[PDB]
Symmetry: D3
Amino acid sequence: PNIKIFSGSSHQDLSQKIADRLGLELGKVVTKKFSNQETCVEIGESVRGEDVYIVQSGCGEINDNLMELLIMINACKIASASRVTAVIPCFPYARQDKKDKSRAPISAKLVANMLSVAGADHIITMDLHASQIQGFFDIPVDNLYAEPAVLKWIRENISEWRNCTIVSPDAGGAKRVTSIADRLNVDFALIHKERKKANEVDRMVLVGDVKDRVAILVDDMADTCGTICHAADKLLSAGATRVYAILTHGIFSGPAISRINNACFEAVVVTNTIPQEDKMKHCSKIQVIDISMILAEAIRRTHNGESVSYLFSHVP
Amino acid sequence: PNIKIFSGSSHQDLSQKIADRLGLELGKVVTKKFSNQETCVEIGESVRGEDVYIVQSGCGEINDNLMELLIMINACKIASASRVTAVIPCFPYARQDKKDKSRAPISAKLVANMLSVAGADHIITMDLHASQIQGFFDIPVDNLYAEPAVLKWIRENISEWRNCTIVSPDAGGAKRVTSIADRLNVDFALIHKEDRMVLVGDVKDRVAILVDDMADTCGTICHAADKLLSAGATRVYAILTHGIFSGPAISRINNACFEAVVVTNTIPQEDKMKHCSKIQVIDISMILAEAIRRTHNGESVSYLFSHVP
Amino acid sequence: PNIKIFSGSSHQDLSQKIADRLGLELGKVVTKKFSNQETCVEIGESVRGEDVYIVQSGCGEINDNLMELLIMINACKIASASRVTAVIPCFPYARQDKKDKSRAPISAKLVANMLSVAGADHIITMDLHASQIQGFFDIPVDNLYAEPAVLKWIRENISEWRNCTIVSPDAGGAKRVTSIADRLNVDFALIHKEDRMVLVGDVKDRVAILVDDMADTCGTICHAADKLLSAGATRVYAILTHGIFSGPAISRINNACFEAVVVTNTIPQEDKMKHCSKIQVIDISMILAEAIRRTHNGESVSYLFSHVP
Amino acid sequence: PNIKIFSGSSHQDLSQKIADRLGLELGKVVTKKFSNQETCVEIGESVRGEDVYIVQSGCGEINDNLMELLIMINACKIASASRVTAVIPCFPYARQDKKDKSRAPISAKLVANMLSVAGADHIITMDLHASQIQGFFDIPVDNLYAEPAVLKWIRENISEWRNCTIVSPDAGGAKRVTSIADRLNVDFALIHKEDRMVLVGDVKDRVAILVDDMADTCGTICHAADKLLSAGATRVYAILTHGIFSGPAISRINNACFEAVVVTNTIPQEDKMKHCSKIQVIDISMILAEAIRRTHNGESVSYLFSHVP
Amino acid sequence: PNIKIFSGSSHQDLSQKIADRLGLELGKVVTKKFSNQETCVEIGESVRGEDVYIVQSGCGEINDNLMELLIMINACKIASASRVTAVIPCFPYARQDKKDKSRAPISAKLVANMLSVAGADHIITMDLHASQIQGFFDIPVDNLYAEPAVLKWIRENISEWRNCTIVSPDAGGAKRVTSIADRLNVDFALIHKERKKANEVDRMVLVGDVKDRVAILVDDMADTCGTICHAADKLLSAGATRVYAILTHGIFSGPAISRINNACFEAVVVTNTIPQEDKMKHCSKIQVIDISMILAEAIRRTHNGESVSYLFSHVP
Amino acid sequence: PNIKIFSGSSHQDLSQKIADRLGLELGKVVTKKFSNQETCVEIGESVRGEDVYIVQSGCGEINDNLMELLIMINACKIASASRVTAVIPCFPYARQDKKDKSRAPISAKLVANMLSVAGADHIITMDLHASQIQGFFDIPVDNLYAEPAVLKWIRENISEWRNCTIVSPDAGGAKRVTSIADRLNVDFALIHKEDRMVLVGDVKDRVAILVDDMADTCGTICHAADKLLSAGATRVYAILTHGIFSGPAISRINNACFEAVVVTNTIPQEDKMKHCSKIQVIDISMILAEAIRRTHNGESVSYLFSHVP
Ligand SMILES: Nc1ncnc2c1ncn2[C@@H]1O[C@H](COP(=O)(O)OP(=O)(O)OP(=O)(O)O)[C@@H](O)[C@H]1O
Ligand SMILES: Nc1ncnc2c1ncn2[C@@H]1O[C@H](COP(=O)(O)OP(=O)(O)OP(=O)(O)O)[C@@H](O)[C@H]1O
Ligand SMILES: Nc1ncnc2c1ncn2[C@@H]1O[C@H](COP(=O)(O)OP(=O)(O)OP(=O)(O)O)[C@@H](O)[C@H]1O
Ligand SMILES: Nc1ncnc2c1ncn2[C@@H]1O[C@H](COP(=O)(O)OP(=O)(O)OP(=O)(O)O)[C@@H](O)[C@H]1O
Ligand SMILES: O=P(O)(O)OC[C@H]1O[C@H](OP(=O)(O)OP(=O)(O)O)[C@H](O)[C@@H]1O
Ligand SMILES: O=P(O)(O)OC[C@H]1O[C@H](O)[C@H](O)[C@@H]1O
Ligand SMILES: O=P(O)(O)OC[C@H]1O[C@H](O)[C@H](O)[C@@H]1O
Ligand SMILES: [Mg+2]
Ligand SMILES: [Mg+2]
Ligand SMILES: [Mg+2]
Ligand SMILES: [Mg+2]
Ligand SMILES: [Mg+2]
Ligand SMILES: [Mg+2]
């Protein structure tokens, strides 16, 4: 089997970058809409006995993109592909990974079931919101990390990075930021939101020295940017010289762009798991780390039977 | 177990009509979108041990509505509903029921698989594009027919129906028109394209009634009506269960010679009816309500294939 | 993995022809019956790690042959074959592909489920009665077409084929005849019953060619031929991929006006050919052999949809 | 849900007896063959929400009867029966329950898989050849025993039963004969072949009773009876739950020294009884009827393992 | 169908308490071991058409108890029970709910799969280590919370409860403690915990004020008690007046009893999801909250089709 | 894909012997227990795209070892191994292969289901207690036989083997002893209990060889040996593939008249051999290594049923 790379309509630039890194052309596929807005898919070349990788991120018109991905997987599977891999850089419905005390769906599990029933044999994703989502599948899931790229960006783009502090915005971010700070051998600070009972103003609690220093918030995603904006205001109050935010998933929905433009961030850095050009047009402080080399290496290593976890710590 | 009816966002008015016919209130459910446009579903009441029916048609923003339906089914299933039934008046992706020479998905089969894995124990639908779609499922599927309501409309609205002709627009669905003509005891004239059309069956000085399962772009019925008017039919009617009316459909209907374009309300029609005066709607909420009630009570559903409740 | 071809008992000659075209011997298998008429299957050679193809058509004693096929698939699967493919030239129970108003099984879906649970990873078949049957499976299904061989036969056997007409016997399968007429660049005359038949398309002083997927009792083609001869066609031919010819079929063909009834050899025809002089057979073993070879080698199978190998 | 009993074509008289014992009429079903010998099934009454029992034994044309059973199960399942139970008095392919050194199917497992995928929720059977077959299913399987009826027959028909001997024909099934001898408080003499046979247990001047699960060709019981008569047994009886009697069985029984060959009516016996005077039948319809009634009512089925109803 | 409660060998006292609250006798079942130490199970009464509840906790000889539960489920399923429910107060292998950056199993997913294939139709458990484990199943899972009983105990046992801090010892507990701090209307604090090796705690960071106030560490389980002992040390160093520890699952393996006896806790409160009598014989400061009423009510409400989530906020 | 052999904790020496015969090192794996006694598994090397074999026998702390095996299979499966094979020399819960009259689990079927859901694509085992267990799986199962190694041991260790007798201890497994006697061309004397035992077959002044699949408490072989010594056998041997030897087994063997109790090393025997001088071990690591090598290379495994490698 040879590698065949197909792009969904969600992130064509990323698929092209990945295909270029692998020395391949993107596979021929028509992905459009019928008049009544049903997804139309037509695989334009034989995939019989091939190793097929479909690249589609959970962004934009999320339900349209997810349906398109499922339909493409099904089309490849009944076209007798030897193996079908969903390359989903930003996993959709990842934040609905549990019920809690609510009569709610576990939408991430439903997405996993849908991907499996469509025919996917392998999932490659980046920085799952909760790595327990790996257990929502029976097929193997390769959960890559943007951390090596993040460390590279910090070391090349921040002059005081040896004296910076890596800040977690919420309680759930402390593990990622501690891993980053351990790799950088720098201090870290932790932030979380206090109880919604001091009705005068919502209060952030910060532990760890940041005064007269460069502070770097790190998180998995910024959707409405409430989290990072609150954390950045807290950090500015505590005397940090400059504030950066680094995120793998730049969703930037709702008021995110206005909030960022009005915030004190020196830079908001995201990976390109989601297309960012349109958002960068409206926000001068968004910078993008390319992760297409990580994805290309993951695809190539899965195809060749090489170790993918080598990419957890080594920039290709 | 009691009946609980939940509405998706696609067709709220139909769900309300069904609930009124059953003497029930619609179940409390929040169906909206998160900021990033992911579907958010919250079941506002316990469904534990209940017989849940979720009403969602394959119309409008079809992918959003299908995702919403699947998410609602999943929420009800993991909330320990005794049984979950998807009431899908217009089945999405029904026209992608085969490959036939192309490297294409069988999207209808994928939709059936997704409904099954979401947890649906039962499907109720109306006038499937291909009844072979029933075989795409391993759970029972009740495929209702609009034909009794169509026959009622014909008898109460077309004064010359005893002399009329029932015309299939494409050769594929002529089975429907033969059944209707047999019920009415009339001739079934047939039409198919060769940019020219060929028609068998005397239509001169008569009323012709086109019958089909759906009108999407109305290319099919407008061409057939042009042919029929070429052959001297006094009036031409079109009757369809699913009024999708996407793309240029409203303009084509406005510029066509139809006396009336009758559709069922498996799909909401008010917006289309605003822009097109010749669209009339047959309410099929009684048929769906009766199907729900009969499946719940263990009564015969196939009795509805020939009886207006 | 190497190709291993095994024959069921239904169509030994076809399996041998396929094996010769592939340069292979048929795999050693004992397929017989115990005293109480239960199927006995014994794989006479290791299939461990091999690409196994089992050839069995849905003909003759259909239930025995289907059971034999399932038992052979199971034996090969638990003997650690790398892949098992059912080569089913005529798919059994294909005409029971829907319910449509009756409390009936969807037997084709049941057969698909049984083939899947027996362990088939892949299906190769020819001219499925309804291509929606491909959606009854979750494994890939390659539905081959007899059309290239049919076109070759028409060009080499009917001197007036450029002026002929391609006639569908029932409205359902007119898609096949339109494809054939487009390939030949001729008119497609159509026929359907109203005990009377209606025909569109000039057939006078011409050759008419009936094309259909199968002839079981030949009621369908004999009625169509009677109609065509009413309208002055000089000769009438019937061409079918599946020559089932059950019941009164041979007598009806003998008493009908067909110049020729051409069938493929998806079903053995020698016994029927003994009693009917106008039956001719098109060998499709090259198409099946090429499909097997291309699936094994990862080559395009759809290339066969338009090319005679 | 109410009990609905449907009969396959294999054993109509047994199904009628079961239905009479339950105070029910047999459900309306058309079970016939199309012209090309494909099974045709039509459920003549709604089974929606009902507890359906389909009675079909693995006898006669076994592959046809098995296909018919699977098709009936599928029809009832997609007709929204609340539960479908296959009542299979003689389980087909039960003797192919293992491979053991040969490249052979495990046909019993395939049959179990097919019954499961057809939609059976429950299996009722009698004296499975190997009770490990219960583990071939993931659904519950109630394996009934003919032993209470056999003990009743022995006590009411053999005057010297207190002095008799219960003999296993092959070493495999001696468990059955030990259970029977323990119930009767008698000795269990054993027999196995080395073309010569070896017997342990005093049989001289006594009655010997061969007990086995089935007699197919009667090679097993005729050899055992020859041995027993060599050792001076005054009379020899054979008792079996399944009287298959295929091949040369009737002639061998006629030429053997059996005082009686008693079988249950898990398989119809009238035709065999016409040609063999020493065959007698034990009715087990009460046991099957009680099992059906107890599974329906949630009552203990295992109570039947030791009690004649 | 009637309720039939069967007990496994793990927590017989809990099963008896549950049966008493339901006005039922425990079902007749033999659960022992063959000579070669395979599990032997024999159901001593017909379960045909019944609603069967099997109570087995993930404690003691965990693999033995898990196999016994699976075998009991299988026996009941093939004895034609109308419904089989696994009542698992402490879910075994819950802490192996993800891979992270390791070639490790997701053992919790495996256990969910084995429960499903054995024939379980429904799971009742309490305070799952990660509620994403609910998504590991396709059958419904009722995850009950000890929180109502915990609130009862706090209000009836700590005099200064209106002026206390609720402290999470790791991030996984944060939601829990915040909920509790909401109900009591008090302050919370979060401790970020880093482990390098299994069963050992490496570093801790306290975020949130605890000075001059009673501290209530709240967590889901105490296995080796390294987490709560390190957390109590951190709280005292930060100036907590006194430290209580409240957990639902009292595993108390390894050095746990020794560490607790040498620690500074006013009390270590656990529920009886795991049997505690032996541990209490050697450790004076362990108190037990009975949760058998919650479990019995959940069983009764699932049987009767009543609301189970009503128990998330209401002690019966 | 390359062969990777991983050892569970049950039988490390056997796994090492297998790995040496294949010219491989054991794969790096950490298999230990957390503080609360939950199994901890860590695969120390990439298995992506490799053919993984996990060696674990159903012995010792059986539930711990079975859990460890399932957890290892799961870890290898989600680490993208191309294929995972469980090499289980002694299959756990094999004796619970049926219910038979009791409200009991079929634990062997549960174990098969658990192995399948954990992700095993293939099972290799030796002398299953009941070969019907192969039908408990849907994946291929290669059931190897110790018989070639047993025959080799008999020929090289019993000087009078041409005159010896092969004795089955229970009627159930006499098939094994008939196969062995046929291979050796000797008589197969049989034994079964009625607290008394009955024996057929001249054993006087001869060597008797008891052959069975396993010895757990040795109640079965000690009773049989007592019977044989009653009938004048000069020496009595016991040969078993699985030497479980639980409970009072070692004391019974020490107090019995066995010349030798020979077992294979499907279960570690050193500890038992310390306390019992008459236990001897046949190494079957060559058979398991050859089976692994042949499954990997697509070579015939059944060739090992009759050939010592
Ligand atoms: N939502 C859609 N809108 C428009 N075309 C669609 C849609 N879904 C599928 N199609 C395409 O429409 C075609 C199916 O057309 P249609 O159902 O009218 O005819 P058919 O299936 O060929 O024959 P018939 O229904 O007459 O037996 C296919 O090419 C299919 O890909
Ligand atoms: N083997 C068989 N022989 C004869 N009739 C059969 C067989 N199997 C099914 N049938 C019946 O034949 C009918 C199907 O007929 P047919 O396929 O010719 O037409 P259709 O499916 O209604 O329409 P079309 O194929 O023209 O779209 C059904 O009533 C079905 O029950
Ligand atoms: N319908 C059948 N008629 C005859 N023989 C059959 C049938 N089905 C399977 N067999 C064969 O019969 C043999 C099984 O024989 P049988 O059940 O009498 O003995 P066994 O399984 O070896 O041992 P036992 O039942 O005494 O423990 C196998 O070789 C099997 O292939
Ligand atoms: N690990 C075990 N140790 C001891 N007894 C067990 C074990 N597992 C199951 N059993 C019991 O042992 C019995 C099975 O015994 P055994 O396999 O010796 O004879 P059988 O299956 O009745 O007949 P045979 O094997 O001779 O055909 C059953 O009652 C079963 O519950
Ligand atoms: O063995 P002990 O020292 O008593 O520790 C037991 C801890 O293990 C779990 O924490 P985990 O490390 O899984 O972190 P999490 O709760 O944040 O997932 C659990 O939350 C307990 O705090
Ligand atoms: O609230 P938003 O800023 O829109 O979303 C970003 C954060 O919210 C979620 O918890 C994510 O994991 C991030 O931590
Ligand atoms: O009873 P034990 O001696 O412990 O177990 C050994 C025998 O018991 C079982 O039937 C085995 O197959 C052996 O024949
Ligand atoms: Mg977060
Ligand atoms: Mg149409
Ligand atoms: Mg036709
Ligand atoms: Mg026998
Ligand atoms: Mg924790
Ligand atoms: Mg034995």
